[PDB]
Amino acid sequence: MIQTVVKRDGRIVGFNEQKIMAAIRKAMLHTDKGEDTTLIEQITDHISYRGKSQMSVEAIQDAIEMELMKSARKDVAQKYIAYRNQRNIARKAKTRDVFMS
Amino acid sequence: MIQTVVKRDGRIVGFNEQKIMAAIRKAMLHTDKGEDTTLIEQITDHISYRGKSQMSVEAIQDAIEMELMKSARKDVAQKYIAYRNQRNIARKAKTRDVFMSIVDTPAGMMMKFASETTKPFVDDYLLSEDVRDAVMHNYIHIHDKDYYPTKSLTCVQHPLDVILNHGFTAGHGSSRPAKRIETAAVLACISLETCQNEMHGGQAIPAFDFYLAPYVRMSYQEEVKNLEKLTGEDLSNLYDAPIDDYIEKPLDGLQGRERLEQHAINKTVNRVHQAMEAFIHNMNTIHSRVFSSINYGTDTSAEGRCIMREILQSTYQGVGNGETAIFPIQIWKKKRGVNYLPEDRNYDLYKLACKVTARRFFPNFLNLDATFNQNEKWRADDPERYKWEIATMGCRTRVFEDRWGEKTSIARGNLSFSTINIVKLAIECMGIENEKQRIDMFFAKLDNILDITAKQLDERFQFQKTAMAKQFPLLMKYLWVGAENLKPEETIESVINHGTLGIGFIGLAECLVALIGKHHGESEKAQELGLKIITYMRDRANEFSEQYHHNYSILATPAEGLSGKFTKKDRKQFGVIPGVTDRDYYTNSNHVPVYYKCTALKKAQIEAPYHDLTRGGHIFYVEINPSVIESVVDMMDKYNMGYGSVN
Numbered sequence: 001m002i003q004t005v006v007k008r009d010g011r012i013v014g015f016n017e018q019k020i021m022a023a024i025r026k027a028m029l030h031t032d033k034g035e036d037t038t039l040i041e042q043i044t045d046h047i048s049y050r051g052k053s054q055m056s057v058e059a060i061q062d063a064i065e066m067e068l069m070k071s072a073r074k075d076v077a078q079k080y081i082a083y084r085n086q087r088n089i090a091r092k093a094k095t096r097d098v099f100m101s
Numbered sequence: 102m103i104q105t106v107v108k109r110d111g112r113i114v115g116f117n118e119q120k121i122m123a124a125i126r127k128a129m130l131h132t133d134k135g136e137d138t139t140l141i142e143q144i145t146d147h148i149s150y151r152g153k154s155q156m157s158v159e160a161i162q163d164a165i166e167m168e169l170m171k172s173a174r175k176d177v178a179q180k181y182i183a184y185r186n187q188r189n190i191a192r193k194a195k196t197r198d199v200f201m202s203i204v205d206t207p208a209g210m211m212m213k214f215a216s217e218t219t220k221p222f223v224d225d226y227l228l229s230e231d232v233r234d235a236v237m238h239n240y241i242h243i244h245d246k247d248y249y250p251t252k253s254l255t256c257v258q259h260p261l262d263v264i265l266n267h268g269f270t271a272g273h274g275s276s277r278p279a280k281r282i283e284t285a286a287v288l289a290c291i292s293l294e295t296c297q298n299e300m301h302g303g304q305a306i307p308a309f310d311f312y313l314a315p316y317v318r319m320s321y322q323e324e325v326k327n328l329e330k331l332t333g334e335d336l337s338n339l340y341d342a343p344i345d346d347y348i349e350k351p352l353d354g355l356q357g358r359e360r361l362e363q364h365a366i367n368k369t370v371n372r373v374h375q376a377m378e379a380f381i382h383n384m385n386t387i388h389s390r391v392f393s394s395i396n397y398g399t400d401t402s403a404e405g406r407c408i409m410r411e412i413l414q415s416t417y418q419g420v421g422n423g424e425t426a427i428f429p430i431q432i433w434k435k436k437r438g439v440n441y442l443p444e445d446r447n448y449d450l451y452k453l454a455c456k457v458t459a460r461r462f463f464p465n466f467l468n469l470d471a472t473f474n475q476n477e478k479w480r481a482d483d484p485e486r487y488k489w490e491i492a493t494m495g496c497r498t499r500v501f502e503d504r505w506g507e508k509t510s511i512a513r514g515n516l517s518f519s520t521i522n523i524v525k526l527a528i529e530c531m532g533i534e535n536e537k538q539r540i541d542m543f544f545a546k547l548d549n550i551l552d553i554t555a556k557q558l559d560e561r562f563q564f565q566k567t568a569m570a571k572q573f574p575l576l577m578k579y580l581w582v583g584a585e586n587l588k589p590e591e592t593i594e595s596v597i598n599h600g601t602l603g604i605g606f607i608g609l610a611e612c613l614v615a616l617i618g619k620h621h622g623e624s625e626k627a628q629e630l631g632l633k634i635i636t637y638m639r640d641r642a643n644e645f646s647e648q649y650h651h652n653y654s655i656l657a658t659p660a661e662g663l664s665g666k667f668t669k670k671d672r673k674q675f676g677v678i679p680g681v682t683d684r685d686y687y688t689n690s691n692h693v694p695v696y697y698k699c700t701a702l703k704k705a706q707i708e709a710p711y712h713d714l715t716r717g718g719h720i721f722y723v724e725i726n727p728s729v730i731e732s733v734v735d736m737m738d739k740y741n742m743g744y745g746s747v748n
């Protein structure tokens with residue numbers, strides 16, 4: 001398993017194992033079917049190996065993608081790669097560089 | 102196979118296999134490794150055999166993505182499901198407002214962008230942990246949260262004389278003093294609309310009579326000079342000639358030196374008349390293009406009456422082709438000894454004011470003799486009485502008392518205010534059945550929420566200070582108490598304390614229903630609790646004022662930005678309850694609910710004590726001949742009513 005996560009800004013924090021179950025649960029609400037908790041738990045637990053004890057948030061969100069594209073719920077998969085792309089364009093704004101000015 | 106595809110617009114075309122192929126090719130050509138026809142052929146053949154006779158573009162793309170997922174090359178789908186979505190958003194922005202969902206005139210759209218960008222950053226990086234926790238669960242509301250990074254203040258009361266007397270210089274713009282009526286209202290408007298950019302609230306001009314009063318004499322003198330330039334006479338004693346009132350009557354029926362003294366007054370009255378309608382039109386158009394307020398009604402000279410009559414006539418007529426102007430907001434001052442009783446000097450102006458208010462809904466009325474507005478320095482002989490007369494704003498705000506300064510409302514303002522949700526606490530405590538324990542729990546929680554609100558207000562204050570003078574070119578050089586002593590680059594920490602902090606409340610009747618079967622306006626026992634809770638809040642406000650070295654007051658919020666922001670989030674969490682979360686309003690601070698049939702007398706009786714208790718702001722709103730408003734004003738005088746707005 002893993003403990004260290006290096007967020008986008010550059011800080012280091014500890015693994016929580018519960019946030020993932022929120023991200024892979026909010027998407028399934030906008031999908032015409034609220035998937036049973038069994039798949040949430042299975043996918044969450046399947047991120048135990050394949051780690052390195054330190055992985056960036058980009059890696060942990062670019063790996064959960066290639067796990068809903070297999071679990072017979074691609075309906076959820078379609079409405080997960082769209083939201084991420086939406087929010088990766090807003091982050092390019094030079095906004096947090098003005099407040100801290 | 103597939104033979105007909107229905108385009109998005111609606112056309113029907115034939116199935117061409119060379120278009121499902123180039124699309125995947127372009128998707129593949131940006132994914133490091135870029136493959137050849139080996140998989141393209143498989144995907145296209147699979148699609149074009151399992152389908153129906155006729156298909157749509159969206160269905161075909163669904164099939165493309167579904168097959169591109171169930172493959173070995175999954176790096177080509179993640180560049181498909183993104184480009185398609187970007188194109189959807191682009192083609193949806195030709196008739197809708199997609200750019201707002203992610204986060205009509207151009208200026209309004211830009212302001213919406215800025216507000217939405219600013220709000221979450223403040224909600225995260227600036228507040229503290231306890232305050233943030235309180236805000237998240239719908240316990241309080243911070244008014245005007247989007248201007249937090251700009252160390253901004255709410256409102257002020259303009260000392261309009263300091264600019265008319267001398268010249269004012271802002272940026273590269275400079276202006277000399279005034280020398281007639283037309284060049285005075287224009288400067289008043291300039292200074293009234295120049296300070297909006299420096300503040301996030303309303304604007305007010307107190308003593309609308311005295312400040313412009315010296316400027317009805319100058320035009321008279323100039324007209325006399327012009328009427329004695331040609332005639333060769335020496336009308337040198339007409340300058341400071343005492344006058345009774347600047348009334349105008351026809352001219353034919355005299356001759357000689359008594360004919361060239363009624364004409365001058367006529368031209369002067371017309372000159373003063375045009376200017377006031379120009380003022381009203383300017384302030385009315387600026388809004389659509391800016392809250393404003395003007396106070397008058399306690400000047401017993403000859404020029405003040407002229408100004409009052411001119412403004413009243415212009416407002417009564419209307420604007421344009423007879424429409425009712427929305428701004429400026431006009432407020433009429435009533436005192437017992439100046440304009441109330443039949444023997445008083447300004448009875449006629451009062452009657453005219455009632456006549457106009459019976460139609461165009463302005464001016465409002467402010468009791469200048471209430472038990473909590475009286476001042477012990479108002480001298481009827483001083484030429485500077487206005488310094489000791491309370492003034493109010495269109496937002497229902499009051500700034501009179503002071504623990505470290507004089508008791509005036511000139512050159513002072515408000516700095517922030519936050520409202521507190523009270524219905525939620527009562528609903529939450531509704532669980533237990535025993536009556537006494539419910540009240541005990543209510544009082545137990547109210548104290549903690551009040552402490553959190555006070556801490557938030559103080560932190561806001563601590564942040565607002567540290568603002569350099571140059572950030573506010575006009576407010577901190579001519580229109581604040583300590584100006585004329587501050588260098589361009591000095592902080593404003595030495596003058597900020599001459600301000601006020603408000604704690605508002607909303608929806609008391611619902612809070613009563615959650616602890617008894619009737620609200621304040623239906624059962625005698627009900628009001629004994631509303632009075633008690635308001636009293637508790639006032640006492641805690643006094644304690645906080647003593648603790649933190651600031652000024653704190655209780656407030657009835659104007660209900661302009663927070664009308665349903667609380668009830669919706671409360672129905673969802675707790676669900677429908679009869680008469681508490683079933684109307685989509687939450688009633689105002691302490692009024693009687695609009696859906697309960699009640700008369701003026703009973704409402705006034707139940708409301709006046711709260712007016713006494715809420716120093717930071719209060720109202721008494723009643724919805725309906727000039728004799729009708731007289732009953733309202735008399736009702737205000739009979740009890741300790743402060744600010745009425747019947748219209």
Ligand SMILES: Nc1ncnc2c1ncn2[C@H]1C[C@H](O)[C@@H](COP(=O)(O)OP(=O)(O)OP(=O)(O)O)O1
Pocket residue numbers: 005014015016017019020021023024057060061
């Ligand atoms: N401790 C963690 N370990 C691994 N991945 C994490 C962790 N915390 C968050 N993530 C990743 C995967 C989760 O699906 C997703 C949760 O939200 P996240 O992207 O961290 O939000 P955020 O940091 O942009 O915002 P917020 O401050 O609102 O939580 O982020």
Ligand SMILES: Nc1ncnc2c1ncn2[C@H]1C[C@H](O)[C@@H](COP(=O)(O)OP(=O)(O)OP(=O)(O)O)O1
Pocket residue numbers: 022023024026027030061079080083084087088091
């Ligand atoms: N309603 C939803 N629909 C689709 N995806 C969702 C939804 N709610 C959450 N998600 C996804 C998006 C992210 O992967 C994760 C939630 O993190 P979120 O804060 O929304 O994204 P983010 O890390 O891109 O944020 P930001 O860039 O704003 O800090 O779950």
Ligand SMILES: Nc1ncnc2c1ncn2[C@H]1C[C@H](O)[C@@H](COP(=O)(O)OP(=O)(O)OP(=O)(O)O)O1
Pocket residue numbers: 106109114115116117118120121124158161162165
């Ligand atoms: N002739 C066609 N036969 C089958 N599918 C088609 C055809 N034309 C378009 N499609 C479907 C499948 C393609 O994956 C998807 C994208 O087509 P594309 O040519 O990019 O858009 P379009 O035909 O609406 O017009 P445009 O030239 O503006 O792109 O549309």
Ligand SMILES: Nc1ncnc2c1ncn2[C@H]1C[C@H](O)[C@@H](COP(=O)(O)OP(=O)(O)OP(=O)(O)O)O1
Pocket residue numbers: 124125127128131180181184185188192
């Ligand atoms: N640069 C690209 N990166 C990834 N995939 C792409 C790219 N360009 C095209 N594609 C793929 C995904 C698109 O759904 C498909 C059709 O492209 P295109 O004809 O430009 O779009 P479209 O017909 O949906 O848009 P439009 O609204 O302009 O008609 O080709």
Ligand SMILES: Nc1ncnc2c1ncn2[C@H]1C[C@H](O)[C@@H](COP(=O)(O)OP(=O)(O)OP(=O)(O)O)O1
Pocket residue numbers: 276277278279280281284287291
């Ligand atoms: N709309 C306006 N906005 C700003 N400044 C204005 C505006 N209109 C006029 N001014 C200037 C002109 C003068 O500088 C000052 C008003 O002075 P005023 O009393 O009208 O006459 P004056 O001093 O120019 O007259 P004189 O020519 O007799 O010297 O404001």
Ligand SMILES: [Mg+2]
Pocket residue numbers: 375378
């Ligand atoms: Mg005219």
